Amino acid sequence: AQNGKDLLIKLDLTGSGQFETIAGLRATRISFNAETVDVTSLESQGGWRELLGGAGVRSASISGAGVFKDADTDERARQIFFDGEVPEFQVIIPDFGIVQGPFMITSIDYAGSHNGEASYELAMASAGALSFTA
Amino acid sequence: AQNGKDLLIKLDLTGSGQFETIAGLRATRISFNAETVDVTSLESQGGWRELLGGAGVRSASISGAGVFKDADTDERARQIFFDGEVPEFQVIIPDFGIVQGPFMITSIDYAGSHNGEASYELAMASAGALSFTA
Amino acid sequence: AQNGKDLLIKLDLTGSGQFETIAGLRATRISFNAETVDVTSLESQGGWRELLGGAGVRSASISGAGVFKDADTDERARQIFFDGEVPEFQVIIPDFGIVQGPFMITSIDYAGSHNGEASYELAMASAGALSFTA
Amino acid sequence: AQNGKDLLIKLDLTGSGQFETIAGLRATRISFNAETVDVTSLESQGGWRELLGGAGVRSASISGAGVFKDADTDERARQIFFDGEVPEFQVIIPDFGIVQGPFMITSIDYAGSHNGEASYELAMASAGALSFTA
Amino acid sequence: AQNGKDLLIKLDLTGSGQFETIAGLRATRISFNAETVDVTSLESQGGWRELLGGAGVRSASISGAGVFKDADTDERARQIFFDGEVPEFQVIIPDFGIVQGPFMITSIDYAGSHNGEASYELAMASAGALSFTA
Amino acid sequence: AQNGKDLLIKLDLTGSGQFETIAGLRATRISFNAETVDVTSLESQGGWRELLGGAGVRSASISGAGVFKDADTDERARQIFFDGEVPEFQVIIPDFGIVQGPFMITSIDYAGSHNGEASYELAMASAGALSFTA
Amino acid sequence: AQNGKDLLIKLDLTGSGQFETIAGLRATRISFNAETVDVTSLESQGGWRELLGGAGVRSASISGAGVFKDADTDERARQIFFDGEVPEFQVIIPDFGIVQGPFMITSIDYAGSHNGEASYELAMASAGALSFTA
Amino acid sequence: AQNGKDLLIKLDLTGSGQFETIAGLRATRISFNAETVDVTSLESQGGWRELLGGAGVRSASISGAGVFKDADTDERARQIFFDGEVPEFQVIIPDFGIVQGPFMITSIDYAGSHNGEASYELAMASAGALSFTA
Amino acid sequence: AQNGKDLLIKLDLTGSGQFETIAGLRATRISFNAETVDVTSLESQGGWRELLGGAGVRSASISGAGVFKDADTDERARQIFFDGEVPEFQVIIPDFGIVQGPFMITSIDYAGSHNGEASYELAMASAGALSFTA
Amino acid sequence: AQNGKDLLIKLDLTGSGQFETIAGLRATRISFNAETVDVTSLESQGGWRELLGGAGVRSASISGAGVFKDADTDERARQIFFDGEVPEFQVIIPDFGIVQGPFMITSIDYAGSHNGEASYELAMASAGALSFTA
Amino acid sequence: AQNGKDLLIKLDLTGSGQFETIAGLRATRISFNAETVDVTSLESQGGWRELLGGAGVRSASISGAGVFKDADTDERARQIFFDGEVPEFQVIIPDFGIVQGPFMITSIDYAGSHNGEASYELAMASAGALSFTA
Amino acid sequence: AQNGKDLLIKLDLTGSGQFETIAGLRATRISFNAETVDVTSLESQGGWRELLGGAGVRSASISGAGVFKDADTDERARQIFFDGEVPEFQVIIPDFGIVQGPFMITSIDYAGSHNGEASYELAMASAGALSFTA
């Protein structure tokens, strides 16, 4: 078993190796996807859908949500949306290890309520090759 | 940490620098978006979806909801829908700072109930360049 | 602050100036919309989505629901669906004032239950120019 | 005010004037619709969406649900689905009066549970001209 | 009135007349459908949507869900998905009578939980002519 | 009757016959599908939708969710997403028997919360012929 | 004034008119209920909650408790729970008269103590129309 | 000071002005309620919950209990539950004056014991506008 | 009349017919339940809630409490909670006869005090068909 | 120490500054509440629940009960329920000082018994900003 | 028979085998629970609720209360709440034997009065597998 | 053993280290809580509910009640509710030591009676990290 509060997603401050967790984030998710490229012949020994595997494009989608704690790492998340770039990110699956890919911050949104805290959600998409440091 | 009741979205009364909060607004949200322009080559070192970053169009969507308090700032929100223009707006992320862009008021709607208060929601979309005053 | 039970939507009995509230209506809503006509140049000082404002078509959508009280104003709502015309309607935002536009009654529906009352919903759409009498 | 249990929808037994309520039906609804045919000129005094009114096609949709009581009127609802015809139906809005149009029974469905009763839903669509007897 | 536990859906064991209920099934539904083929003339005495009735294709959709009881009738439901055929099925509306049509088993799915029972859902579609034995 | 905790889905460690359950998985589902290829003639003895049966392509979709227990079988699930291949999988319907087909791991996603455990969902799709060992 | 020991609740022995009191019952109660179907208009001359009256479903709940005296009428109460049916019951309000409705025996429970007598409680619910013979 | 035995609740015998006390009633209570419709702005000078007052629906609940004295006024309480109507009632707060509203009798229940008297409780709910005659 | 100390609830020692009372149990209760499946039509001759009777699921709940006497029958109650099974139980209503159903031991709890004895409560739920041997 | 009979809650007679105690009130209570808005980060130095403080909405609830003494201040409590308004109230904590806020009278109820006095309870809720005069 | 003061619940001092009773504890209770996973088929020979037994999750809940005696075993109960872990506990049912499972201390609370002693309650929940040493 | 009158809960006067007991408080309680985050695998060696321990959020709830003695420490408890902040508090478990955390005062309430003293209750909730000074 493994606790969820050790599944940290990290952002670059200087753009080179200085990885810090964003802010108070309450729910986090890295989501991988494949594209299921259908190769169904005339012969499929009963008509089973045969798949190809290597050919589909693959992606990783980050989804993070939490409370607005105005750390410097949170402002470095805000500004890389503005001069929209694809910096390097790092998700630590808590005892798998490090994901370490570049991601583009597609959607950032700051929400508040009269009776609640200021909360931000944060969604990112894969921008390049992913790795696995362990 | 930071309270949500200091995330104010402001509207122009005279159209030039006179920024006031709209009315009793109970939930507010500024939502940013990118367009994820896919550049996936023949070579992607395993088939990872490569993204471009700078090329996608970017947007900001305001979503505000609250109780109908018939302030002058609320009527100035109503009339700019009618002679539909793109005036300047200002969202204050509570200790980031000022957003300060022009927005078009796409959807305004006044709702009431027999056992409830009169409530308005308010949705706006980006009309131009956004800034960050801090 | 302002109560929701003073947000009355009114219908014409004679088709000329004789405006009455429909029936026992429990929830009412006038909903305005713009069309967000995108004008995004090659140059947008960072790629911000620029909007045009004046060009989009604009609309108003009425949504009313309530209990079936068989007033004469309710039958005048029923018959104008049948010989389908675009009579003049009037929404009173409770201390803004009068909306006063022509609307077509798109959807009317009479619903009942074995353990409930007879209820009608009522949805209308903009048929022409809107005003603001205040 | 008016009770919902007097909003009866009636079916023809002999196909000519012999109208009976279907079965134990617990929720009933007649739903009318118009088609909102858009006529938006170059000139619309501000860009308001102008509508035409008389041109859109109009419809009536019956939605009835209830418990399976195997009356003869319920079997006459079953068989007119099979040799699919458009017999005459009659909805009595409880103190408006009679609707009296022909409807096609589009969807009938008999559902049961291990811990529940046998229930049928019943959806019909307009097949011709509607009337209003009052 | 009529109990829902007498609405049995039956499957063929030998493919010829030997009809048995599947397994422990907790919710069952046979759902019929018509296609509402629109015939709206230039003249429709007010613009009412006129329908044709006999022309639309008609269908029957079975939906069954329940607990996985590994009867022989359940394995005969599994194997007819594999060598995908259209065997004869029988729904008994509890005091209407017998439906008796051929159906193709489109979707079968076996689901389990760590704290629950093993449950299967089962969805079928019409494969031919339907009858009514009563 | 049959317990749900004996519906195990198994993954290959060495790619050849060494089948182990993934991790702590809390909900599991194998979902089969057919394609309902419509063959509706001009003659269908009343207009019943006739189906063909053998012609539609057929598929199996695995859906597994559970807690992140970092077993070696869980890392072997992670890596086969990366060098995306179609290894052999095995679902044991608890007293039917073995499913034993090749599947591609389309979607894997590792999710955590500040107050919850680290959880993974896991969705797979059919990559070839399915069997039934019993 | 009127004594409570003349408020007898009676059960059918043969299912047809042969009504006998159950056993030694020490406390008895017939409880009627309405459903308070809310019809609150936009206008209610001050906002008073207006009710409809005729539309709500109505029920009768029997509650009987007493000592286990193993009469034949007590065993006829036990067996109608097992082959669960809705036989006819009769409550005699002592100088109103007879209630005479069908009731389903929802809850029967036989309780004993080491220092007490064997006691049964008995709760029933309305199964149909109620009457009043007086 | 004021005695409680002069707080009489009265029922209509003929339905028009003929008001009599029910029976031997030992405890009586008229209970009024408001709905506390929350209007809490973004600004509330410290975050105090601001309320609206006029908008909430208001109700009156009668609760009466006593001994079963089989007066004609008690039978007129019984029968108006059966053909469930909303007759006019009258509570006399002993030196305020008269309440005089219509009420629906939601719950009536006749209870007896082997060692006690026959007792009835009686609960009513507001059905319309309330007054105050004094 | 009948004593409560002859209302014995019995447990299986060998799992086959060897029924013994548990321990010193001071209060015992078998509680039966039905599910009151509501079938309320549009017509109910006044709006009486009509019930169905045969369709509701039925259950039996055992509740036993007493002093901890460490008999072998008490340890056989403890262990069947651990390897959680549904063995056969037997309640003897003292001159009705035998209940004889299978029950699952849902809740067992051993409680002690500094000034009291060691006491256990014991709650069971129906696991299958119930009988009545008499 | 301080006596409880000097904790007076006062009502406005003229609506402006004329504050009087209601009637014979036997138990009184002003109850304040906060909303505990949870801000629990990913990091909380051990997982302690961190709170925000300023963001939660705050309220004050009056609860008063006593004997019905028909003073003019008691009738001014009755009538402000009817034309439901939010007048100004004043609680004197006996040597703190004055509370002085506006409150809505949510629940008033007049109760009497055959052997008791006429008693009223009285519950109010916060309608706006609270103060502290001391 | 067996005394309650020999039902000791024991805590680990070193985390490995060194089990001591907590403090002066006046009332203690270990409470076991099952989850009653319902498997009710279409056929249940009369509609009896059939249960599954092996599938439900099972738990053990400790409830201990007593006087605050500041032993070292009491401080070892306090600190394992702070760095919240799941250490091993041991309940000795006095002549059954040893329970010996890991438990998480969910709720600890220290209470005192001006005229009473300092008392602590203590509630724990099952964290893993339970045993039975006897 | 240890007396309850040495379990003092202390409040800050200046907000920095100046800790005093509130007032005459008659009953006091600090209550800790964990969140029992369930991690129940497919395998749990018999189906025991396995828990995670470190992941659940943890809290501390103060409950204090007593007589209104208008000390300066009592007014400092009143005012920190008004400008609602999260000051530092200190509970002294009498020979454990000091708790020393920040708490928000959720509920304060001043109650009085005609024959009793003025009493206040006081409930607080955890606002941050807790400590243990001993």
Which of D49, D130, D133 is the best residue to mutate to test the C interface, defined by the most C CB atoms within 10 Å of its own CB? D49
Q: Do J33 and L106 touch (CB under 8 A)?
A: yes
**Neighbour tally for G87: CB within 10 Å:** 19
Decide if C49 and B68 are in contact by the 8 Å CB cutoff: no
Neighbours of chain A (3+ CB pairs under 8 A): B, C, E, F, H, J, L
User: Which residues, listed in sequence order, are joined to residue E88 by a DSSP beta bridge?
Assistant: E102
By C-alpha distance, the chain L residue nearest K116 is: L4
* Å between F29 CA and nearest CA of chain A: 18
Q: Are B123 and B106 in contact (CB under 8 A)?
A: yes
Spatial CB neighbours of I17, under 8 Å, sequence gap ≥ 6 = none
- Select from B62, B66, B52, B67 the least CA-distant residue to B11: B62
Could you tell me if L113 and J4 are in contact, meaning their C-beta atoms sit under 8 angstroms apart?
A: yes
The span from the first CA to the last CA of chain J, in angstroms, equals: 17
3-state class (DSSP) for residue L29:
strand
Of residues D31, D36, D32, the one with CA closest to residue D56: D36
Round to whole Å and give the CA distance between F110 and A93: 7
Residue with tokens 């001009």: F42
Please name the residue that has the structure tokens 């317990």.
F3
Q: Which of H35, H36, H39 to mutate to test the interface with C (most CBs of C within 10 A)?
A: H39
Using an 8 Å Cβ cutoff, are K133 and L18 in contact? no
Share of chain C residues as helix, strand and coil, in percent rounded to the nearest 5: 10, 45, 45
Q: Do chains J and H touch (3 or more CB pairs under 8 A)?
A: yes
Closest-approach residue (CA) in chain L for F113: L55
Compute the CA torsion angle H106, H112, H117, H120 (nearest 10 deg).
Answer: 0
Name every chain K residue with its beta carbon within 8 A of the beta carbon of J46: 82-84
For an interface test with K, the pick among L44, L50, L91, L99 (most K C-beta atoms closer than 10 Å) comes out as L50
| Cα distances (angstroms) measured from residue H60 to each of A53, G33, G38, H130, L80 | 69, 18, 13, 8, 38
DSSP annotation string for F33-76: E----B---S--TTTB--B-SSSS-BEEEEEEEEE----HHHHH
Beta bridge partners of A103: A126
How far D1 CA sits from the closest chain E CA (Å)?
30
Residue of chain A whose alpha carbon sits nearest to that of L40? A1
Do B and I make contact via 3 or more CB pairs under 8 A? The reply is no
Identify how the structure was determined: cryo-EM
The minimum CA-CA distance between I54 and chain E, rounded to whole Å, is 7
Q: How many Cβ pairs within 8 Å bridge chains E and K?
A: 35
Query: What's the angle, vertex CA D112, arms to CA D111 and CA D114, rounded to 5?
Result: 160
DSSP tag of D4: G
Closest CA–CA distance from residue L50 to any residue of chain E (Å): 12
Least Cα separation, residue D124 to chain F (angstroms): 19
Contacts of K68 (CB under 8 A, 6+ apart): K23, K24, K74, K110, K112, K117, K118, K119, K120, L1, L2, L93, L94
- Nearest beta carbon to residue I117 from set K1, K28, K46: K1
CA distance C5 to chain H (A): 7
Measured at the alpha carbon of residue C63, what is the angle toward residues D123 and D97, in degrees to the nearest 5? 50
Give the whole-angstrom CA distance, residue D5 versus residue F43: 44
Task: Check E114 against F56: CB less than 8 A apart.
Answer: no
Helix or strand holding residue D82 (H, E): helix D72-82
Instruction: Name the 3-class secondary structure at F107.
Output: strand
CB atoms within 10 A of CB E74: 22
Alpha carbons within 13 A on the beta-carbon side of A66:
28
Of F82, F33, F64, F107, whose CA–CA distance to A35 is shortest? Answer: F107
Cβ F47–D84 below 8 Å, yes or no? yes
Contact B104, B62 (CB under 8 A): no
Residues facing residue C60 across a β-bridge: C32
* Interatomic CA distance for residues C70 and C74, integer angstroms: 6
- Report, in angstroms and rounded to the nearest whole number, the Rg of chain I calculated over CA atoms: 18
Distance between CA atoms of D115 and D111, rounded to whole angstroms? 12
User: Using a CB-CB distance cutoff of 8 angstroms, which residues of chain A are in contact with residue C47?
Assistant: 84
The C-alpha of D30 sits at a distance from chain C's nearest C-alpha, in angstroms, of 6
G42 to B114, C24, C26, F122, H56: CA distances (angstroms):
5, 6, 6, 52, 11
Rounded CA separation G121/G63 (Å): 8
Whole-angstrom Cα distance, residue C70 to residue D3? 11
- Calpha distance L92→L11 (Å, rounded): 11
K–H touching, 3+ CB–CB pairs within 8 Å: no
Interface of B with C (CB under 8 A): 24, 54-59, 67-70, 75, 78-79, 81-82, 84-86, 101, 104-119, 125-130
C112 to chain I, closest Cα gap in Å = 10
Q: Which of I41, I50, I54 is closest, CB to CB, to E3?
A: I54
Q: Coil, strand or helix: which one is H72?
A: helix
Q: What's the residue count for chain H?
A: 134
The chain F residues in contact with chain J (CB within 8 A) are: 114-115
Handedness of CA K85, K87, K92, K96 (dihedral sign): positive
Main-chain phi, psi angles of J4, to 5 degrees: -80, -20
Subunits adjacent to chain B (3 or more Cβ pairs under 8 Å): A, C, D, F, G, H, J
Question: Which candidate, H128, I47, H100, places its Cα nearest to that of G39?
Answer: H128
What does the alpha-carbon distance between residue C118 and residue I42 come to, in Å, rounded to a whole number? 13
Give yes or no for a contact between E64 and E77, defined as CB atoms under 8 angstroms apart.
Answer: no
> What is the Cα–Cα distance from A107 to A64, expressed in whole angstroms?
10
H27, H47, H52: residue with CB nearest J58? H47
Q: Which two tokens stand for residue L130?
A: 């807790």
Q: Which of B78, B86, B115 sits opposite C51 (nearest CB)?
A: B86
- The sign of the CA dihedral I75, I76, I82, I88 is negative
Question: Cβ distance L4 to K118 under 8 Å?
Answer: yes
Closest-CA residue of E relative to I37 is: E3
Interface size between E and I, measured as CB pairs under 8 A: 10
- Residues G112 and I91: their CA atoms lie apart, in Å, by 12
Q: Do D115 and K40 touch (CB under 8 A)?
A: yes
CA–CA gap between residue C6 and residue B121 (Å, rounded): 18
Q: Find chain D residues with C-beta within 8 A of I58's C-beta.
A: none
CB-CB neighbors (< 8 A) of E45 in chain C: none
Can you give the resolution of this entry in Å?
3.8
Other C-beta atoms closer than 10 Å to the C-beta of K107 total 18
Smallest Cα–Cα separation from A75: which of A30, A108, A114?
A108
Residue of I nearest to E3 (CA): I55
Query: Measured between alpha carbons, how far is residue G25 from residues G68, I43, J53, L125 in Å?
Result: 8, 35, 58, 51
- The token pair that represents B52 in the structure block: 């471009």
- C-alpha span between G32 and H81 (Å, rounded): 8
Could you give the CA distance from residue K36 to residue K51 in angstroms, rounded to a whole number?
7
d(CA H64, CA H26): 8
Residue L93's nearest CA partner among K13, K70, K65, K66 is: K70
**Cβ of A112 and B54 within 8 Å?**
no
Which one of F35, F83, F108, F109 makes the best mutation probe of the A interface by having the most chain A beta carbons within 10 Å? F109
Sign, CA torsion C67/C70/C71/C73: positive
Chain K residues bordering chain E (beta-carbon distance below 8 Å) = 35, 37-43, 47, 52, 55-57
J4: Cα within 13 Å, side-chain hemisphere: 19
Residues of J in contact with L128 (CB under 8 A): 48, 50-51
Q: Are B90 and B131 in contact (CB under 8 A)?
A: no
Residues of F in contact with A93 (CB under 8 A): 68, 110, 118
Residue type, B96: F
Strand residue runs (E) in chain K: 8-12, 19-21, 25-33, 59-67, 88-93, 97-98, 101-113, 119-126
Question: Tokens standing for C117?
Answer: 């009352």
